[PDB]
Design a protein around this ligand. Structure first.
Ligand SMILES: CC(=O)N[C@H]1[C@H]([C@H](O)[C@H](O)CO)O[C@@](O)(C(=O)O)C[C@@H]1O
Ligand SMILES: CO[C@@H]1O[C@H](CO)[C@H](O)[C@@H]2COC(C)(C)O[C@@H]12
Ligand SMILES: [Zn+2]
Length: 189
């Protein structure tokens, strides 16, 4: 197991927090959220920079992963608009198809339902949760990942690709999509 794959395994096994309906204060390219447990400094490194207002921003969700450098609570992207109404049921049910080739002659497919609970969702959150799922259920990063990818397809045919042999690019972590319009998620291992 390369150091590279070891490092991916370490990163995607880190704790994450899903914080809901908080205020974020923007100064420069950092947005500070505080609750009763933690303070998080969220770095804007992409087109999120054009969306978050200078100063106070209300009613945001944040998907938090602490990046590696001491006593830091730095995270990157992961900011969304909170749900406009309460959803007790899932916002959307999505077919997740994980395909795995083993040896020379075997294909295997796991087909489940993937629960979307948020009207708007960051690529950060999709990427991190799906990889953690694959670590947990499909032995991701036990072997070299090679050309392994996730693809998220929207109802209109738009799609987003996460290549599993590197981290998600930091400029993509603050990109957001409409959870209602996700159609399916396919993974090729
Ligand atoms: C324009 C669009 O909706 N999707 C495009 C995405 C996104 O621009 C970025 O992934 C956002 O981070 O890039 C690519 C991909 O991911 O496979 C091609 C695809 O057409
Ligand atoms: C290689 O750079 C980007 O990486 C993504 C996967 O990491 C995804 O495939 C992107 C989708 O759209 C284009 C413009 C082809 O840019 C791609
Ligand atoms: Zn409901």
């Amino acid at each position: 197991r390369s150091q590279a794959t070891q490092d991916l395994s370490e990163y995607y096994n880190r704790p994450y927090f899903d914080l809901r309906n908080l205020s974020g204060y923007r100064e420069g390219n950092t947005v500070t959220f505080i609750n009763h447990y933690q303070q998080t400094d969220v770095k804007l490194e992409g087109k999120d920079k054009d969306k978050i207002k200078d100063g106070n921003n209300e009613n945001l969700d944040v998907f938090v992963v602490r990046e590696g450098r001491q006593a830091d609570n730095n995270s990157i992207g992961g900011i969304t608009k909170t749900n406009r109404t309460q959803h007790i049921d899932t916002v959307q049910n999505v077919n997740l198809l994980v395909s795995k080739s083993t040896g020379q002659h075997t294909t295997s497919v796991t087909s489940t339902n993937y629960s979307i609970y948020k009207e708007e969702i960051s690529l950060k959150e999709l990427d991190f949760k799906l990889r953690k799922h694959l670590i947990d259920k499909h032995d991701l990063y036990k072997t070299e990942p090679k050309d392994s990818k996730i693809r998220v397809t929207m109802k209109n045919g738009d799609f987003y690709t996460f290549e599993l042999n590197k981290k998600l690019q930091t400029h993509r972590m603050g990109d957001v999509i409409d959870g209602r319009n996700i159609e399916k998620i396919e993974v090729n291992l």
